[PDB]
Inverse folding.
């Protein structure tokens, strides 16, 4: 299960990091944008893996 | 700070420029893959078999 867990951490952290660099947003706003982008995807991924 | 100011010195300096070239080459190759999808569909069928 290590692969799934590290993927779930890395995806969020990197996506926040990517948004922060490309758009130049502050960390909090960038995190909001990134989570808005990937929250439904994460829930669907959980359902699929289940 | 200073936008996407990746390091340009040392191992991390070389990695950042290597990866950017790698990413550009990848997104260019995918461009060439999408021009002829059918051939790679045949490749996928070969892989499945």
């Amino acid at each position: 299960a290590i692969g799934l867990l590290v993927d779930d951490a890395i995806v969020v952290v990197e996506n926040v990091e990517r948004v922060m660099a490309e758009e130049g947003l502050p960390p909090k706003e960038a995190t909001r944008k990134s989570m808005g982008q990937i929250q439904g995807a994460l829930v669907g991924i959980a359902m699929v893996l289940s | 700070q200073k936008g996407s100011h990746g390091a340009t010195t040392g191992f991390f300096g070389w990695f950042n420029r290597m990866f950017d070239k790698s990413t550009h080459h990848y997104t260019d190759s995918v461009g060439n893959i999408l021009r002829s999808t059918g051939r790679y569909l045949v490749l996928y069928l070969i892989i499945v078999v």
